[PDB]
Design a binder for this molecule. Structure first.
Ligand SMILES: C[C@@H]1CC[C@@]2(OC1)O[C@H]1[C@@H](O)[C@H]3[C@@H]4CC[C@H]5C[C@@H](O[C@@H]6O[C@H](CO)[C@H](O[C@@H]7O[C@H](CO)[C@@H](O)[C@H](O[C@@H]8OC[C@@H](O)[C@H](O)[C@H]8O)[C@H]7O[C@@H]7O[C@H](CO)[C@H](O)[C@H](O[C@@H]8O[C@H](CO)[C@@H](O)[C@H](O)[C@H]8O)[C@H]7O)[C@H](O)[C@H]6O)[C@H](O)C[C@]5(C)[C@H]4CC[C@]3(C)[C@H]1[C@@H]2C
Ligand SMILES: C[C@@H]1CC[C@@]2(OC1)O[C@H]1[C@@H](O)[C@H]3[C@@H]4CC[C@H]5C[C@@H](O[C@@H]6O[C@H](CO)[C@H](O[C@@H]7O[C@H](CO)[C@@H](O)[C@H](O[C@@H]8OC[C@@H](O)[C@H](O)[C@H]8O)[C@H]7O[C@@H]7O[C@H](CO)[C@H](O)[C@H](O[C@@H]8O[C@H](CO)[C@@H](O)[C@H](O)[C@H]8O)[C@H]7O)[C@H](O)[C@H]6O)[C@H](O)C[C@]5(C)[C@H]4CC[C@]3(C)[C@H]1[C@@H]2C
Ligand SMILES: CC(C)CCC[C@@H](C)[C@H]1CC[C@H]2[C@H]3CC=C4C[C@@H](OC(=O)CCC(=O)O)CC[C@]4(C)[C@H]3CC[C@]12C
Ligand SMILES: CC(C)CCC[C@@H](C)[C@H]1CC[C@H]2[C@H]3CC=C4C[C@@H](OC(=O)CCC(=O)O)CC[C@]4(C)[C@H]3CC[C@]12C
Ligand SMILES: CC(C)CCC[C@@H](C)[C@H]1CC[C@H]2[C@H]3CC=C4C[C@@H](OC(=O)CCC(=O)O)CC[C@]4(C)[C@H]3CC[C@]12C
Ligand SMILES: CC(C)CCC[C@@H](C)[C@H]1CC[C@H]2[C@H]3CC=C4C[C@@H](OC(=O)CCC(=O)O)CC[C@]4(C)[C@H]3CC[C@]12C
Ligand SMILES: CC(C)CCC[C@@H](C)[C@H]1CC[C@H]2[C@H]3CC=C4C[C@@H](OC(=O)CCC(=O)O)CC[C@]4(C)[C@H]3CC[C@]12C
Ligand SMILES: CC(C)CCC[C@@H](C)[C@H]1CC[C@H]2[C@H]3CC=C4C[C@@H](OC(=O)CCC(=O)O)CC[C@]4(C)[C@H]3CC[C@]12C
Lengths: 106, 118, 120, 281, 237
């Protein structure tokens, strides 16, 4: 079980400003991370796959970066549709383990 | 356009068994795996396991080896999961989730959530 | 033949440990310890495949040699402890041999064997 | 992108793929050149692709079985990507075979007989073996896929079937078995724990050691016979025997490489032979 | 889905009317028949009987009599109809026949029928078995017949005869399993509920009767290729 960790627990932001999360792994997992966005009373909705490759249908503000152990997802200009919980998942070794969750706020 | 329709909420008693259906419609059912994820209270996603629909070759997570056994219904396009010997800790949402269409995609298509209550 | 010989030596070492564990007489144990002496001295020459690129004047090689030295040391202790017919203390020495084996030898041996097969 | 799937195209290859696919075809064309005296560039590439396709398609049959226990590059693989790739490869093979028929002067009944009967005759008796008895049923594929690739390559060039191209391809048939057996040896404990059965598990640790040496040292005896009795040129593969001794002492990257050297020197032996110095040419 | 339903209908139709179909089949065979180098054979006849006995001893493990009795009755009629056809298209051919006979699929369909619990349920079980084992066997009987059939155009006489026996073996073997056998297995269990194979078989059946997809897709391409080889060799050439 590759234990994943995440570093603001609750992130307080303002509309327009840039934000950044940090899914720091315990082991070296190559470039295998996946960032899901779960809103209130909804399902997880894939945003970035393998730490950098954007998903067709997602707004362009979602941009992933980093490799090796430290990974970072960042949004440039948050809207009313970005207030949600963000989990990171490794698909490198089995079982696949999720992060903790980074919640947004106004 | 793939959708994974899922069963409704289930109220049960401790020690019972429950069965959840994920009616996968919109694609060749026997081509992809059918994974399962448990979202407990406190918002912590855990991977239960997977099942190959063609054979029925399951492959579980070592934590969920005892109390979660996946089966498949190839006739009606329905993947099942049976939770046995329930306790207060197993009240959670359960998603069915499969991979993207092409190679080198991660899990796009999720279900909707079966709100199990003990 | 190296990995095969290594495997044989290791298995015969377990076999010797087991016959010592199930022994009731003196002469058997008295020959077993000399067989262990022989097996250990044969395995001492058998250098690990993991440490081939480095010269024998490295700390790890001295540690490997010292590990084998503390094995044979306890075998020698078992000789001078069991030559008068007392097998219980020799058994206890064999039990401590397991601990030092698992401490260095077995960890290293289970590494050398793994390394050897991979190249071939 | 193309690279993320180029990393997926290594899924249909094994360490013994070069020795089983491409070395036979190269030998067969050398035989055809040494026998008849005219060689075709186009047919060589066609044969080279037609054989690799059928080999790769057969490797994916074994790849699909590795989803049973969870024995399975750095991407999430599903059992649709294997099926789609196996189908594509085999279709590529058949298209290459059709183009070879059109270009060459071989009769269609014989080209079908070899290609569909021999090369693609594996698929008939696999599917029922299960994930345990794959490695055991693979010896039988490697014994027959080697000589038939040499004949296929030879026949397409010359324009009729022969019998000697099977006899000339015994050394290359044995050298590939050495790689497969040596690979099965190191995975003995893991396959035994997982419930898998191979030859090396069935016969034991020491009989494996005898079999490995037999398969390693027979080719050199065959070349030693052919060198002194038939043609002095065909002693060129005996320049690798110091490596074979090193391999016998250290007991599959080294084995796989030895096969490549043996195969190369064997082909260069066949080419450099004097006119009418080799049997049945 | 569409083929499974069709084979279901066939299975149920044959299972429902045993007496008429078996008489019709035998009558047809009567109307067919009564209308009008040692070393190679030795090695072939030595290996073939070993293969048959291996398969019988594999069947022996189940621990039931009726499965052996039914598997035995399939063999006799397949061997009989092959003898009829091989006489009509002309002792020494049996070594190649006994290699191509498929007793696993004959046993499987019987095991489906033996897991029943009532005389009405047996027929529905035969139909359910037929639906799973119909397409899988038809495709194999197609491929193997075409693949052996390509050798009858080669030129070599021994091979041209050895392949002809193989083709007529596979076809006569398939026809029996489709027509005669399901009626026979229905009728034997009809005239005789002391058959315990439920709890063991009812889990493994639907996983076992699944071949490899990578094989089953390649067989269709091979089938489609061989049809062109044949079609081009016969008519156009
Ligand atoms: C792994 C199986 C698969 C099937 C099979 O066995 C292994 O592989 C096939 C393989 O291909 C065999 C061939 C090997 C080489 C043989 C050679 C021989 O060729 C002759 O054919 C004349 C053609 O012009 C030549 O003149 C003549 O000079 C030459 O001698 C022919 O008579 C039969 C022959 C082709 C054989 C017939 C039987 C097979 C087809 C074998 C048999 C089905
Ligand atoms: C002109 C040339 C051409 C080439 C060539 O020469 C001339 O002609 C060719 C000719 O055409 C030949 C073929 C003729 C047809 C033959 C048929 C036979 O195929 C068998 O293989 C399976 C079909 O692919 C079926 O059985 C399995 O079917 C699977 C699903 O389809 C199950 O998954 C599996 O599982 C079951 O068995 C195993 C488990 O323990 C059980 O719990 C489980 O329920 C079954 O496995 C069974 O099938 C056999 C193994 O395949 C064993 O007999 C039997 O034991 C085994 O339980 C079985 O129905 C079938 O019979 C195979 O054995 C050899 C065969 C292909 C021959 C090989 C050699 C040739 C190609 C010859 C030769 C090169
Ligand atoms: C190996 C398997 C797939 C069986 C092979 C089946 C063949 C009998 C078929 C496949 C495609 C066929 C055709 C390939 C091309 C020619 C020439 C073509 O007409 C041309 O002159 C065009 C030539 C060109 O420019 O490519 C008409 C059909 C014909 C005679 C056919 C000959 C027989 C072929 C090779
Ligand atoms: C060149 C040609 C003519 C050689 C003939 C090739 C096959 C008929 C042979 C090669 C290996 C054989 C056997 C090797 C040992 C096993 C176990 C045997 O019986 C079992 O134990 C059942 C287990 C299972 O298959 O799951 C059935 C499959 C298999 C692969 C056999 C099936 C027939 C096989 C594939
Ligand atoms: C290898 C080739 C020659 C045949 C491969 C396919 C057949 C084994 C199967 C496929 C569907 C079958 C069925 C197609 C439709 C007819 C008519 C029909 O007969 C009835 O029972 C009357 C209608 C009814 O009451 O259902 C159903 C079964 C039957 C005889 C079957 C005949 C055999 C068929 C063609
Ligand atoms: C005799 C002449 C005048 C007419 C030719 C008709 C038939 C010989 C053809 C028509 C449709 C064919 C197919 C009908 C369905 C089967 C099963 C089918 O499905 C599978 O088995 C796929 C694999 C699987 O599902 O396990 C594949 C083609 C096949 C073998 C074919 C067998 C031969 C058939 C009956
Ligand atoms: C599409 C569906 C219906 C399946 C097709 C498979 C078979 C029903 C066909 C395809 C080609 C056929 C033929 C292949 C070559 C001939 C030669 C022919 O002549 C001889 O061998 C000498 C004896 C004589 O003079 O008849 C006898 C029938 C036979 C073996 C046929 C057997 C049945 C075969 C294999
Ligand atoms: C389970 C398997 C191994 C048994 C079924 C495979 C047989 C159908 C095959 C294996 C090798 C074959 C060949 C064995 C040797 C002979 C003689 C051989 O020599 C010639 O007659 C040359 C003729 C010419 O020059 O054209 C040609 C092929 C032939 C008839 C073949 C007959 C059929 C055989 C026995």
């Amino acid at each position: 079980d590759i234990l994943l960790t995440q570093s603001p627990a609750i992130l307080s932001v303002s509309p327009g400003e840039r934000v950044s999360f940090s899914c720091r792994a315990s082991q070296s997992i190559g470039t295998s991370i996946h960032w899901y966005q779960q809103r209130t009373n909804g399902s997880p909705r894939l945003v970035i796959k393998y730490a950098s490759e954007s998903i067709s249908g997602i707004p362009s503000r979602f941009s992933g970066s980093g490799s090796g152990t430290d990974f970072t997802l960042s949004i440039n200009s948050v809207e009313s549709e970005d207030i949600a919980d963000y989990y990171c998942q490794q698909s490198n070794s089995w079982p696949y383990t999720f992060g903790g969750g980074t919640k947004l706020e106004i | 356009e793939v959708q994974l329709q899922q069963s409704g909420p289930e109220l049960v008693k401790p020690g019972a068994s429950v069965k959840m259906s994920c009616k996968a419609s919109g694609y060749s059912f026997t081509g992809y795996f059918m994974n399962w994820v448990k979202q407990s209270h406190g918002k912590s996603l855990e991977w239960i396991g997977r099942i190959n629909p063609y054979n029925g070759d399951t492959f579980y997570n070592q934590k969920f080896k005892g109390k979660a056994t996946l089966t498949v219904d190839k006739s009606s396009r329905t993947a099942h999961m049976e939770l046995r010997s329930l306790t207060s800790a197993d009240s959670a949402l359960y998603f069915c989730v499969r991979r993207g269409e092409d190679y080198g995609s991660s899990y796009n298509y999720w279900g909707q959530g079966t709100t199990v209550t003990v | 033949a190296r990995r095969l010989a290594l495997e044989d030596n290791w298995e015969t070492l377990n076999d010797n440990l087991k016959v010592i564990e199930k022994a009731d007489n003196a002469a058997q144990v008295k020959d077993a310890l000399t067989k262990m002496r022989a097996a250990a001295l044969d395995a001492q020459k058998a250098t690990p495949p993991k440490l081939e690129d480095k010269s024998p004047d490295s700390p790890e090689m001295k540690d490997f040699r010292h590990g084998f030295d503390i094995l044979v040391g306890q075998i020698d202790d078992a000789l001078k402890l069991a030559n008068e017919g007392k097998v219980k203390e020799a058994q206890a020495a064999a039990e401590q041999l397991k601990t030092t084996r698992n401490a260095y030898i077995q960890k290293y041996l289970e590494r050398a064997r793994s390394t050897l097969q991979k190249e071939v | 992108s193309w690279r993320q799937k180029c990393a997926s195209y290594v899924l249909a290859l094994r360490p013994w793929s070069f020795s089983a696919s491409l070395t036979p075809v190269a030998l067969g064309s050398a035989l055809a050149y040494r026998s008849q005296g005219v060689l075709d560039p186009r047919l060589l590439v066609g044969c080279a692709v037609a054989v690799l396709a059928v080999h790769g398609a057969g490797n994916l049959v074994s790849t699909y079985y590795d989803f049973s226990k969870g024995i399975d590059v750095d991407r999430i693989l599903e059992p649709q990507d294997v099926v789609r790739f196996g189908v594509f490869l085999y279709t590529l093979g058949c298209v290459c075979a059709a183009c070879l028929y059109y270009l060459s002067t071989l009769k269609l009944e014989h080209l079908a007989l070899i290609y569909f009967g021999g090369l693609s005759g594996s698929f008939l008796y696999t599917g029922g073996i299960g994930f345990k008895y794959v490695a055991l049923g693979d010896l039988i594929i490697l014994i027959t896929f080697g000589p038939l690739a040499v004949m296929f390559a030879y026949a397409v060039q010359v324009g009729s079937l022969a019998i000697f191209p099977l006899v000339y391809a015994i050394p290359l048939a044995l050298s590939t078995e050495a790689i497969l057996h040596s690979n099965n040896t190191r995975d003995m404990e893991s396959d035994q724990e997982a419930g898998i059965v191979t030859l090396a598990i069935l016969i034991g640790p020491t009989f494996s050691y005898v079999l490995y040496n037999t398969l390693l040292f027979l080719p050199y005896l065959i070349f030693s016979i052919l060198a002194t009795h038939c043609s002095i040129s065909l002693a060129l593969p005996l320049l690798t025997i110091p490596m074979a001794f090193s391999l016998e002492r250290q007991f599959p990257q080294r084995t796989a490489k030895l096969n490549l050297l043996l195969g190369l020197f064997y082909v260069f032996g066949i080419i450099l032979a004097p006119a009418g110095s080799l049997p049945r040419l | 889905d569409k083929l499974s339903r069709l084979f279901r209908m066939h299975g149920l139709f044959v299972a429902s009317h045993p007496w008429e179909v078996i008489v019709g089949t035998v009558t047809l065979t009567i109307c067919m028949m009564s209308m009008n180098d040692i070393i190679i054979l030795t090695i072939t006849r030595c290996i073939a009987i070993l293969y048959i006995y291996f398969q019988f001893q594999n069947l022996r493990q189940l621990g039931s009599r009726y499965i052996l009795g039914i598997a035995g009755l399939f063999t006799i009629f397949s061997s009989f109809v092959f003898s009829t056809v091989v006489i009509h298209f002309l002792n020494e051919a049996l070594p190649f026949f006994l290699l191509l006979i498929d007793l696993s699929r004959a046993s499987a369909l019987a095991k489906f029928a033996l897991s029943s619990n009532s005389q009405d349920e047996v027929r529905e079980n035969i139909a359910r078995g037929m639906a799973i084992l119909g397409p899988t066997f038809t495709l194999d009987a197609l491929v193997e017949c075409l693949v052996i059939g390509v050798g009858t155009m080669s030129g070599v006489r021994q091979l041209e005869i050895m392949c002809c026996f193989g083709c007529m073996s596979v076809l006569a073997n398939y026809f029996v399993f489709m027509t005669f056998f399901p009626a026979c297995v229905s009728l034997v269990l009809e005239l005789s509920p002391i058959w315990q194979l439920s709890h063991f078989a009812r889990v493994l059946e639907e996983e076992e009767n699944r071949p490899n997809p990578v094989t089953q897709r390649v067989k269709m391409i091979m089938s489609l290729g061989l049809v062109l080889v044949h079609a081009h060799s016969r008519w156009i050439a």
